[PDB]
Amino acid sequence: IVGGKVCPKGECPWQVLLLVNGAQLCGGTLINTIWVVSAAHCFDKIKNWRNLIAVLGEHDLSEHDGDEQSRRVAQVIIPSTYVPGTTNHDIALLRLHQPVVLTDHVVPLCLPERTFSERTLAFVRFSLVSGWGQLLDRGATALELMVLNVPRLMTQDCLQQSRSPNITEYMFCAGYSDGSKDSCKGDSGGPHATHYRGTWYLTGIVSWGQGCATVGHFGVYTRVSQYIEWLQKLMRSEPRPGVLLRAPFP
Amino acid sequence: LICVNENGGCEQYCSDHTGTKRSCRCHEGYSLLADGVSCTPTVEYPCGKIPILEKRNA
Numbered sequence A: 001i002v003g004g005k006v007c008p009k010g011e012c013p014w015q016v017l018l019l020v021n022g023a024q025l026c027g028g029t030l031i032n033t034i035w036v037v038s039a040a041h042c043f044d045k046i047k048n049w050r051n052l053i054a055v056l057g058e059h060d061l062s063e064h065d066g067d068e069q070s071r072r073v074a075q076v077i078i079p080s081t082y083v084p085g086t087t088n089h090d091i092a093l094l095r096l097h098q099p100v101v102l103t104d105h106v107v108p109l110c111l112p113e114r115t116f117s118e119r120t121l122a123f124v125r126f127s128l129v130s131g132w133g134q135l136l137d138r139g140a141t142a143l144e145l146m147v148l149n150v151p152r153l154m155t156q157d158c159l160q161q162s163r164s165p166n167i168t169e170y171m172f173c174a175g176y177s178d179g180s181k182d183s184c185k186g187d188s189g190g191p192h193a194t195h196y197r198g199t200w201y202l203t204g205i206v207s208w209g210q211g212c213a214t215v216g217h218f219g220v221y222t223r224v225s226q227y228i229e230w231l232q233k234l235m236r237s238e239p240r241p242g243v244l245l246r247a248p249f250p
Numbered sequence B: 001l002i003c004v005n006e007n008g009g010c011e012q013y014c015s016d017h018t019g020t021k022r023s024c025r026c027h028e029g030y031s032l033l034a035d036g037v038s039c040t041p042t043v044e045y046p047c048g049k050i051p052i053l054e055k056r057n058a
């Protein structure tokens, strides 16, 4: 996160850290005790699935404070329509090996109903994006969880205001064109969370693209509303042997 | 009331029904109040609420 601030400990309780062989991979979003939403691209290069760990209740990576909860990942589910190393359909559903325990520091983000998301949430201007990603383009990653308020653009407006992969119906633009504020490498998979009448909801996933905080460009986010039904169906399904699962989309 | 407008007055989820009918609903871990619009937590850690903040104002 570029141009944000530290998310005070416990104020981003749905934020997940994904590690591979102990190394920072990506972010994620807790949506219930055993389910995490992330970005498909995070998993493009994974060799050994057994080395993938999700951490809840994380804040300051430099220390252990006892609020952290680590889990193995039992399943990584990606849409059939996702092509590695691209942007479209950049979403993943992760099943944890064991539930996290909800605490003051570990709380799921609400996965909204599609109708609600489309009719209401999509029109809330500002939303929060978070992670332990790069603090600057070509800079070091964050030791403390960062958060940033970004405004959402209608796709038409995004295109106009821009000055590259396409912007599809499965994405949206948010942020700033002035190169001051963005999500960045290390943040992918993390939440774009939207507040409505006292409750927060998952509306986007930090995806990727062309540099971070690049002048003339906006951040690209996976449009979660397009995937609600897909996610819900999967969450009702029994696990299958072998971590990686490609599931038909729609 | 219609769901497309002002969320049908619902705090959370909204369904249109046959007629000038509407039903609000709430996410798991919440219940709908008698106003037919408001949602109240039924569990300690409902989704999309920040405990340290909820407490900060409790």
Ligand SMILES: O=C(NCc1cccc(-n2ncc(-c3cc4cnccc4[nH]3)c2O)c1)Nc1ccccc1
Binding pocket: A025, A026, A041, A042, A043, A044, A045, A084, A085, A086, A183, A184, A185, A186, A187, A188, A206, A207, A208, A209, A210, A211, A212
């Ligand atoms: O290498 C793979 N995936 C492996 C992977 C794992 C974990 C993180 C990454 N990764 N790299 C850059 C970014 C990134 C930039 C960026 C800018 N703004 C906002 C968010 C952003 N995220 C990112 O999240 C890639 N895929 C791949 C490639 C090329 C060809 C085929 C597949």
Ligand SMILES: [Ca+2]
Binding pocket: A058, A059, A060, A061, A062, A063, A064, A065, A068
């Ligand atoms: Ca820590």
Ligand SMILES: [Cl-]
Binding pocket: A236, A237, A238
């Ligand atoms: Cl099944």
Ligand SMILES: [Cl-]
Binding pocket: A049, A242, A243, A244
């Ligand atoms: Cl496997």
